[PDB]
């Protein structure tokens, strides 16, 4: 045979732009924390392997709540962990002498950037059996179980540009491609549906079996 | 020293786009004759030398009388001396089977062309001590003193494209760069302000002295 | 180790476009004097070193006061020190036979230019212990202490293009990158907040200590 195995490799499997966030502005600014595990289709793929190391291509598709496009100037700003957050529509942090920023209209084609692998460890990890800090571990401290500090990539804050208040509503949709991917230690895939963003907890009253059950054993 | 004398040469001094005309449409067409000595900043530069030989880069910036841009199709047409002029909004001369023409909307970036040196003599001249024709020279014929025929480059006529009448107002602004310039015989610069387009006549009741006068001679 | 020290060099530290001015048009023209020390984030960076020599990349992002973009033709004009300033919406100085100028609509992507190092000295300086002129120095003359003449780069004037009056409001935002930078003589950084543009004066009733104080020592 001459069946090729090119388009089943690891790089071709992940290079598809999947939705990761929907950011809505119903003061004209938001401070969206970063968590890219809030949508189930890309999350089930990325949690096949334990450790992953990659770059990315983010794409910001912005429109009004019903797909209409009106001329409105926006500004996105990536805030690393430690930088001063913006507090109002016109704070001092929107000057962006240190942070990268994109200025794009709503009428333009959607913007694209190419972020690098920016983690302090060798690779990202979607599973972390342990606590990030030392000290006592009583009952009231169990928010941080399975919260590794080397995955929090700061926040990502958008705004409308002017110092007045704009009369339009904004819904941003962010899509992420994965380039130059290397993975390690594959895991069993998920069958129960997802409930939160930070933990694998499941609905204990509804154990969804994997295989759709039948009636007998001698008849399909 | 290592002081450069590159950006004081003749070519670098003239390659700046200066305003030469403002064409207004308050029947939807104009026949602007050509005279590029109607604005004082470029005219004082070009009348430093007697003879000049160059190509040019014309640029047509078109908008409404208050800078607003509406979608409106226009047409510029360069008319050489001898060609049939347009008479109405839709004459037979707008077919342009011989003359060059530019079709550009008002919403587009401004158009650019690159005209060559098209004079019958070796170079243009801004000064002409003499009469163009022969014959008697009485008092009533003194419009043509200092009017050389090898500088009249025909006219330049614009219009709105459609056969109906458009409801918008047009102000065209033309800017001219100068490339591949060669000059000859420098002249004393002008100090009195300009009054007309075709002659160096000045206000005889207001002799503006060159130097701003002071009070004494032994103190500044 | 193989830790790279590339992205901590002097060139990579300054090549980020920071805000330097906000120009508002609430006669349809302004004559904004040049002073690029009016915003505190880029000013604290550039005043780390005493002398600096660089080119720049300016970027003009223009919109209405609430981010809306309407089709409106504009014109920016850089005026060197000595050139005739514009006085009205349509003066004689808008012909621009000598000065550089940018014509760009509000609907277009923002314009970019690349100005060179245009100072008469070898480098810019953000600190100048001295007076620019000679003569008597009495009390009423102390505006010019610490005002070097080889930093004033003229003005920068914008307008709406037409001879009528446009019905829209303009807010321009200018951003400046720094390319091919060479610096000299680093200085202690600033801790007190900024008060003016031309002098390092501080609020004498509020001495902000650098370190956030604690209760004990042990």
């Amino acid at each position, epitope marked *: 045979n001459h069946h090729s195995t090119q388009e089943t490799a690891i790089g071709n499997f992940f290079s598809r732009a999947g939705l990761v966030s929907i950011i809505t502005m119903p003061d004209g600014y938001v401070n969206w924390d970063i968590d890219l595990m809030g949508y189930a289709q890309l999350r089930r793929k990325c949690e096949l392997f334990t450790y992953m190391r990659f770059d990315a291509e983010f794409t910001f598709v912005v429109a*009004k709540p*019903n797909g*209409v*496009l*009106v001329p409105q100037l926006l500004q996105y700003m990536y805030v690393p962990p430690g930088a001063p957050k913006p507090t109002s529509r016109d704070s001092f942090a929107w000057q962006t002498a240190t942070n990268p920023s994109v200025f794009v209209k709503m009428t333009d084609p959607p913007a694209q950037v190419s972020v690098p692998f920016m983690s302090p460890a060798s690779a990202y990890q979607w599973f972390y059996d342990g606590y990030p800090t030392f000290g006592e571990h009583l009952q009231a401290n169990d928010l941080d179980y399975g919260q590794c500090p080397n995955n929090m990539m700061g926040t990502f804050s958008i705004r409308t540009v002017g110092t*007045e*208040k*704009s*009369p*339009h509503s904004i819904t941003l949709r962010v899509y992420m491609r994965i380039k130059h991917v290397r993975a390690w230690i594959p895991r069993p895939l998920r069958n129960q549906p997802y409930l939160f963003k930070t933990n694998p907890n499941y609905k204990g009253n509804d154990i969804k079996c994997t295989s759709t059950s039948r009636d007998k054993i001698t008849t399909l | 020293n290592h002081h450069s004398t590159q950006e004081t040469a003749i070519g670098n001094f003239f390659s700046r786009a200066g305003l030469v005309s403002i064409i207004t449409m308050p029947d939807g067409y104009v026949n602007w004759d050509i005279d590029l000595m109607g604005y004082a900043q470029l005219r004082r530069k070009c009348e430093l030398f007697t003879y000049m030989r160059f190509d040019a880069e014309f640029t047509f910036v078109v908008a409404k009388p208050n800078g*607003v841009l*509406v979608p409106q199709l226009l047409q510029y047409m360069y008319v050489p001396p001898g060609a049939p002029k347009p008479t109405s909004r839709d004459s037979f001369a707008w077919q342009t089977a011989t003359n060059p023409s530019v079709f550009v909307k008002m919403t587009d970036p401004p158009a650019q062309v690159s005209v060559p040196f098209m004079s019958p003599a070796s170079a243009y001249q801004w000064f002409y001590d003499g009469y163009p024709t022969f014959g008697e020279h009485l008092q009533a014929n003194d419009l043509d003193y200092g009017q050389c025929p090898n500088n009249m480059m025909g006219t330049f006529s614009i219009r709105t494209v459609g056969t109906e009448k458009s*409801p*918008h107002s047009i102000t065209l602004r033309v800017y001219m760069r100068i490339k591949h310039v060669r000059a000859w015989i420098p002249r004393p610069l002008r100090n009195q302000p300009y009054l007309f387009k075709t002659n160096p006549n000045y206000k005889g009741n207001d002799i503006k002295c060159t130097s701003t006068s002071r009070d004494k001679i032994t103190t500044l | 180790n193989h830790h790279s020290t590339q992205e901590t060099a002097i060139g990579n530290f300054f090549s980020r476009a920071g805000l330097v001015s906000i120009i508002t048009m*609430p006669d349809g023209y302004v004559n904004w004097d040049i002073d690029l020390m009016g915003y505190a984030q880029l000013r604290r960076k550039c005043e780390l070193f005493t002398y600096m020599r660089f080119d720049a990349e300016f970027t003009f992002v223009v919109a209405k006061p*609430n981010g*809306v973009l*309407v089709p409106q033709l504009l014109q920016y004009m850089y005026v060197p020190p000595g050139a005739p300033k514009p006085t009205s919406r349509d003066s004689f100085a808008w012909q621009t036979a000598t000065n550089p100028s940018v014509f760009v609509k509000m609907t277009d992507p923002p314009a970019q230019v690349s100005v060179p190092f245009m100072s008469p000295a070898s480098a810019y300086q953000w600190f100048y212990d001295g007076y620019p002129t000679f003569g008597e120095h009495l009390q009423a003359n102390d505006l010019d202490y610490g005002q070097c003449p080889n930093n004033m780069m003229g003005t920068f004037s914008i307008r709406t293009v037409g001879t009528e*009056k446009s*019905p*829209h*409001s303009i807010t321009l935002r200018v951003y400046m990158r720094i390319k091919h930078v060479r610096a000299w003589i680093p200085r202690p950084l600033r801790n007190q907040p900024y008060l003016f543009k031309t002098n390092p004066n501080y609020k004498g009733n509020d001495i902000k200590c650098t370190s956030t104080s604690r209760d004990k020592i042990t």
Partner: antibody, heavy 120, light 113 residues
Framework: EVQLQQSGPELVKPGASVKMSCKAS????????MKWVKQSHGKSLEWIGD????????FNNQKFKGKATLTVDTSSSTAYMQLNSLTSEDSAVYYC?????????????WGQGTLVTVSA | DIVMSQSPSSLAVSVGEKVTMSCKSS????????????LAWYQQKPGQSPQLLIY???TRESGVPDRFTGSESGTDFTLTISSVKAEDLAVFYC?????????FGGGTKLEIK
């Protein structure tokens, strides 16, 4: 939120050229976008132009209704619409309509309108 | 000069539930327009409720009436409201403007309920 007030609606001489003011509610000044209204008595309501002197709309600015559309005076802080006040035509009422943010740009709250009596 | 006509002459309603409008602009430029004042007889004037003829309508009142609605069809139109009783029997009308989205001259013709 609270009510924009006007001055007292009062009268003028057929050649006097007298201003009018529409004293603000109390929140903000000069950041909003002022709009002036003129209606003739057959319920025809033809609008006079905008923001601060940005009043020269589509042919208008002309019957001396809107003539001298002025800027603010900052004392009553919503005062313009100076005119010529011609003989026996400018009999109308005049509304000012400024926005207060959540009523973006267009119409927050109006006044009760100033009747201009040209009756000499 | 350049006019438009909303042409229901009288809405003539017995106190009920359903009623509609149509403003029908005929402006020179055809990309920007937004409309709809209120004009109570007794006292001051609500309004502000914009229907962009071509795309997004309403930058609506999030307060007071939200029962005002939007429109369609590419050609210029504005449409219905809800079931109000003997208070808010007022005279509604569109506004129209020169260059761009602030209130200008052109809100010509009214209609009586």
């Amino acid at each position: 939120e609270v009510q924009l007030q006007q001055s007292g609606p009062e009268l003028v001489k057929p050649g006097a050229s007298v201003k009018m003011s529409c004293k603000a509610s109390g929140y903000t000044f000069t950041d909003y976008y002022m709009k002036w209204v003129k209606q003739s008595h057959g319920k025809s309501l033809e609008w006079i132009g905008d923001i601060n002197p940005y009043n020269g709309d589509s042919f208008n600015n002309q019957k001396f209704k809107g003539k001298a559309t002025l800027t603010v005076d900052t004392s009553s802080s919503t005062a313009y619409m100076q005119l010529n006040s011609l003989t026996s035509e400018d009999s109308a009422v005049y509304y000012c309509a400024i926005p207060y943010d959540y009523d973006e740009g267009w119409f927050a709250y109006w006044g009760q309108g100033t009747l201009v009596t040209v009756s000499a | 000069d350049i006019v438009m006509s909303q042409s229901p002459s009288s809405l003539a309603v017995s106190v009920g539930e359903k009623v509609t409008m149509s403003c029908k602009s005929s402006q020179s430029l055809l990309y920007s327009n937004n409309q709809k004042n209120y004009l109570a007889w007794y006292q001051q004037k609500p309004g502000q409720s914009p229907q962009l003829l071509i795309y997004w309508a309403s930058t609506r009142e999030s307060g007071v009436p939200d029962r005002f609605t939007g429109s369609e069809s590419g050609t210029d139109f504005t449409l219905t409201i809800s079931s109000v009783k003997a208070e808010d029997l007022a005279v509604f009308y569109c506004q129209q403007y020169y260059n761009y989205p602030w209130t200008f001259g052109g809100g010509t013709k009214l209609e009586i309920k």
